[PDB]
Amino acid sequence: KPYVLKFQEISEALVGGKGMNLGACSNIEGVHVPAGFCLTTEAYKEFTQLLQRLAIREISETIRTLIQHTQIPSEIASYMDATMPFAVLLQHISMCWASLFTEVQLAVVIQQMISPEASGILFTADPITSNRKSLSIDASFGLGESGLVSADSYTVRENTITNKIIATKKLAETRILEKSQQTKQTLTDQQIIQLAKLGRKIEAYFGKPQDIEWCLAEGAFYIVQSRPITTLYPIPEVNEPGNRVYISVAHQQMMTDAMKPLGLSFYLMTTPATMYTAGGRLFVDITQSLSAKVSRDMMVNSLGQSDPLIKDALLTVINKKGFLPPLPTVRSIPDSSSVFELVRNSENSIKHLKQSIETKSGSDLFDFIVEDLEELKRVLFNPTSIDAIMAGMDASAWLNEHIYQWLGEKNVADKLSESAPNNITSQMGLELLDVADVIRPYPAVRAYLEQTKNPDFMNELATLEGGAETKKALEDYLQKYGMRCAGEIDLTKTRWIENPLTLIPLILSNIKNFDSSASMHKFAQGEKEAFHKEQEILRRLQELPDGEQKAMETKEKIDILRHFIGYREYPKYGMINRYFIYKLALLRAGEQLVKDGILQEHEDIYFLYFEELREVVRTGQVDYELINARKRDFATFEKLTPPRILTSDGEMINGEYKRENLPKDAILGLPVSSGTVEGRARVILEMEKADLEDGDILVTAYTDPSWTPAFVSIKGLVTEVGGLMTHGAVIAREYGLPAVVGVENATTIIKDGQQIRINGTEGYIEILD
Ligand SMILES: CCOc1c(C)c(O)c2c(O)c3c(CNN4CCN(C)CC4)cc2c1[C@H](O)O/C=C\[C@@H](OC)[C@@H](C)[C@@H](OC(C)=O)[C@@H](C)[C@H](O)[C@@H](C)C(=O)[C@H](C)/C=C/C[C@H](C)C(=O)N3
Numbered sequence: 001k002p003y004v005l006k007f008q009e010i011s012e013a014l015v016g017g018k019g020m021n022l023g024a025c026s027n028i029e030g031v032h033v034p035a036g037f038c039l040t041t042e043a044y045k046e047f048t049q050l051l052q053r054l055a056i057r058e059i060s061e062t063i064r065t066l067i068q069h070t071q072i073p074s075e076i077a078s079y080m081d082a083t084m085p086f087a088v089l090l091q092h093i094s095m096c097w098a099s100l101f102t103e104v105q106l107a108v109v110i111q112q113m114i115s116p117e118a119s120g121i122l123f124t125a126d127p128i129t130s131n132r133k134s135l136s137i138d139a140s141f142g143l144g145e146s147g148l149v150s151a152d153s154y155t156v157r158e159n160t161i162t163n164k165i166i167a168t169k170k171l172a173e174t175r176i177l178e179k180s181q182q183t184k185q186t187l188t189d190q191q192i193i194q195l196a197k198l199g200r201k202i203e204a205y206f207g208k209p210q211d212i213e214w215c216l217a218e219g220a221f222y223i224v225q226s227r228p229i230t231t232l233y234p235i236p237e238v239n240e241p242g243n244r245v246y247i248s249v250a251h252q253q254m255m256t257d258a259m260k261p262l263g264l265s266f267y268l269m270t271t272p273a274t275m276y277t278a279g280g281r282l283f284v285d286i287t288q289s290l291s292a293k294v295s296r297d298m299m300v301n302s303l304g305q306s307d308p309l310i311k312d313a314l315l316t317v318i319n320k321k322g323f324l325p326p327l328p329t330v331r332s333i334p335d336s337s338s339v340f341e342l343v344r345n346s347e348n349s350i351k352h353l354k355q356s357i358e359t360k361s362g363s364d365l366f367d368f369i370v371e372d373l374e375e376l377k378r379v380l381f382n383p384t385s386i387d388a389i390m391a392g393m394d395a396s397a398w399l400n401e402h403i404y405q406w407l408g409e410k411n412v413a414d415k416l417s418e419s420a421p422n423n424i425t426s427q428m429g430l431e432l433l434d435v436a437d438v439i440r441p442y443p444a445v446r447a448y449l450e451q452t453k454n455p456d457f458m459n460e461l462a463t464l465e466g467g468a469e470t471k472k473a474l475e476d477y478l479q480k481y482g483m484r485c486a487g488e489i490d491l492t493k494t495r496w497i498e499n500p501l502t503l504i505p506l507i508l509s510n511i512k513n514f515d516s517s518a519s520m521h522k523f524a525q526g527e528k529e530a531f532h533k534e535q536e537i538l539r540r541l542q543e544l545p546d547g548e549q550k551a552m553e554t555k556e557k558i559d560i561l562r563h564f565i566g567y568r569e570y571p572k573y574g575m576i577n578r579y580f581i582y583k584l585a586l587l588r589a590g591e592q593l594v595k596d597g598i599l600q601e602h603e604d605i606y607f608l609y610f611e612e613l614r615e616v617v618r619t620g621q622v623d624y625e626l627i628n629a630r631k632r633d634f635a636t637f638e639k640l641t642p643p644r645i646l647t648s649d650g651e652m653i654n655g656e657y658k659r660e661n662l663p664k665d666a667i668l669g670l671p672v673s674s675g676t677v678e679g680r681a682r683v684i685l686e687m688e689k690a691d692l693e694d695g696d697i698l699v700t701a702y703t704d705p706s707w708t709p710a711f712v713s714i715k716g717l718v719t720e721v722g723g724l725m726t727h728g729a730v731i732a733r734e735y736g737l738p739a740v741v742g743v744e745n746a747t748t749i750i751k752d753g754q755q756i757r758i759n760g761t762e763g764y765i766e767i768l769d
């Protein structure tokens, strides 16, 4: 309402965003903002006509010649002098408003220009490690603003200024310096802590870790600005006692995208692990495991064999005193038939689910889903199915370690795994070549797919020569695999069969990159490499001391390997099959909620967790300000990146590889598929924008099962996450494709188009030019 506002006196649509900060900082205890007033939105009150006008947004800026000359009554321009040189008469306040046009109201704030002996910035959360318990201060003499001027860096955990980076701050309006004054702390230790202690308190009133700008003037740090820190990764709400340690699911699952609440909910309801969510992603609490030596030796070493960065990061946590409490003081192998029966039992379970869920709606559906989740867990964690999965893994490790010990050949199980039978994910990638084989002879169909952006393009094929054949080949493929997609573990993400257009570029690539039967030739060649390797290994073993026994046991392990390693990819397939069936049903409930005028769009269910959504259907009431909050949350979560290790203090820890004799400027990673190749690096985040061709090396954030069709043309693979037995890596071996995973910032360090050499045996990358 009024024309002028002081700062204890202060309404975002009245004095704006930072007009407030000062207002809700004057009231805080022990502090005091620089004093002064604020010119209000109700001072802003022809201009409207030009406004309605909305190259052409080039000269319309004539609007800003207007405020400068427009003048605005001295009344409020002397009403303001009714309540010290400045910064932010009236030359300026007005030219400022103008700012909304080049780009509607703006409020101008004017404060005190004290001559600060020292001035700086303060984070109550360490900018580097994001540890909530570590406070950082950047201080420089006089006014220095941010991050440019030579400034001391102070790291104060609590009363202990641990690390001091006293920069040689040489250039402290006057502009020159005194030499001895130059290398002395900006703030005294008493002042540092006082400000630290100051800083560690303001966060309480505001709530969250704050970014506080301060200035020291004749012995007092009083606050000029207090922005909230919005960049930190959220801590999993686990109030359970004390300090805890979390493992990133995204890294092991080869899928680092943020997930929506509904999708998150379903993964949590499936897992037997003590799992939690944070930043739209999933984390496993392994704290209890680390509370005892025999359990934490097991945990650390078991995870280290997946990816060493976990182990190294865990050791960092363990070596961190004052955090983790101190320590007080052969598997069965199923027969041959099991794999075939495990698949059929899974397939039949899916069939029954389809015939059962189809008759469910409303709360009946949600009651049914909860019941079917038990069946998912039975199929997913069948003791026999686990024995099948571990059978392939155990055989790999046995081979890799015994062959290298006997012959010096490293990771031999890679070559022996090549073209392993009954791998649902491998088949999917190769069978897309067959689809392209059907389309290739038809010119009219190709001219269509090469150009169309119609989501319903499959409904327009019937008019084309070869369209019926093309549509048929596409339908069969989608019946087998249209249930996968990038981020498939998120139930809410769009499946291939919901958007077949996302497969077209891959198909077009296959049509031009290969001839009439690449699938057969690739698979058969793999079968040949694998058998030739087997013969060679067994031959070279029989010339060792009592080698015919070594060869005999190696032959057994090889047979187990090729019989079971392919099944490893199938449990997720069966799980993903239920997830999609769940999705279609939930979508039908969402549409029903829209018809009832309860939801605005049926996809808004994605931002509700299962139990929350279940209550909405039951009660008929939603809180949209929660949904809208979730939508804002998910948006910020996409801008985040999950750390490999997250602590209860919010500290993000990524492991470090131990470089021994590996090339100087080489980029270290985890070797998961043997071989050395040179090729053009292709940095790609979206598979449908991958213009892959012969000689290319795929560099991406992650390769979950859906990425497999992009493997058929590339000569190497580089990812930022993943592990030894995770998705992607297991497919690289069977495709005979050299691969290095767990490469930190690979999509940033490696420039698209660069020639690189990767070593899938030693695990490194070399930039060639
Ligand atoms: C210490 C690691 O902690 C985890 C982490 C980080 C996870 O992400 C775990 C995880 O995603 C799952 C699971 C489901 N497995 N559970 C837990 C262990 N049980 C013996 C069997 C059922 C566990 C995750 C864990 C877990 O707490 O940590 C311990 C072992 C896992 O990490 C090495 C192993 C068992 C891993 O496989 C390996 C390398 O041996 C798990 C994930 C699993 O066996 C792999 C082979 C898998 O693909 C299963 C079939 C996935 C089922 C999907 C379902 C939704 C699920 O809950 N999976």
Ligand SMILES: [Cl-]
Binding pocket: 451, 452, 453, 454
């Ligand atoms: Cl189109």
